């Protein structure tokens with residue numbers, strides 16, 4: 001233990017080649033601090049009376065919980081103080097946040113400060129999702145800098161407040177998992193260069209929406225339960241927190257689905273701070289992420305609170321579902 005491979009060392013070491021201003025390390029160091037603070041609050045939320053609602057609703061019409069506010073505040077303050085950012089997009093804010101000139105750095109950060117709100121009060125896994133872009137424009141920073149396609153991401157990932165707290169970080173050459181050591185408050189590298197299985201045996205979707213599903217999703221699910229070739233049926237898992245279901249998809253393989261449906265043309269999940277970050281992790285792990293008709297990372301957003309269908313995970317599973325959409329087109 002006298003040689004600790006922390007997230008900071010990792011993001012410093014591997015990136016010494018391309019030099020750079022080093023504000024990405026500043027950025028990620030800052031975000032780790034917010035994530036530790038959120039993790040600590042979550043782990044004692046009931047004793048600190050942090051369960052319940054804040055008394056408000058956000059642009060996508062969610063009921064804001066107390067932990068939403070706390071986590072939102074923590075993430076915004078640390079990112080600003082990092083001197084690495086210029087434009088911030090949060091699920092909890094109607095408009096992009098523009099950093100004050102004095103603290104401006106070159107990155108644009110889209111994040112969900114707390115994901116899995118329906119699972120807060122029952123103590124199921126929740127998390128934090130983020131995607132990071134380089135501001136391209138030369139003009140004054142604005143909400144427009146956030147409206148980039150996911151393929152432009154330079155870094156993305158999530159923190160998972162599960163049985164242990166994990167920071168999953170994807171960058172151009174790959175995905176790596178860091179676990180929070182609660183004793184020293186450091187994120188330690190525990191899974192290097194993570195890759196997803198080509199084919200899994202778990203499917204993950206809320207089948208409560210069966211009555212609204214399109215024929216392709218309907219057929220796909222029926223095929224998981226009754227395989228035509230006599231293989232064993234897939235097992236089902238749906239934690240109900242995107243970070244938990246996506247992380248399982250990553251480390252066990254399989255598919256996660258939040259598709260469009262008869263009442264929700266664009267699905268539910270948010271493109272900027274939910275879908276794109278997870279699509280990027282998946283793609284860097286050798287996985288795929290599709291709306292059913294097009295790659296999530298290639299969508300050019302027009303609304304920072306825009307929704308998108310998303311189907312992701314093991315390439316052979318996701319490809320199987322795409323063939324069914326193509327067959328139905």
Ligand SMILES: O=P(O)(O)OC[C@H]1O[C@](O)(CO)[C@@H](O)[C@@H]1O
Pocket residue numbers: 115116117118206240241242243268269
């Ligand atoms: O209750 P539903 O419609 O299955 O929504 C679950 C999804 O909603 C979210 O909480 C986003 O609001 C995700 O974390 C999760 O994947």
Ligand SMILES: [Mg+2]
Pocket residue numbers: 112114115116242274
């Ligand atoms: Mg969420």
Ligand SMILES: [Mg+2]
Pocket residue numbers: 091112113114115116117
């Ligand atoms: Mg949220």
Ligand SMILES: [Tl+]
Pocket residue numbers: 268269270274
């Ligand atoms: Tl959502």
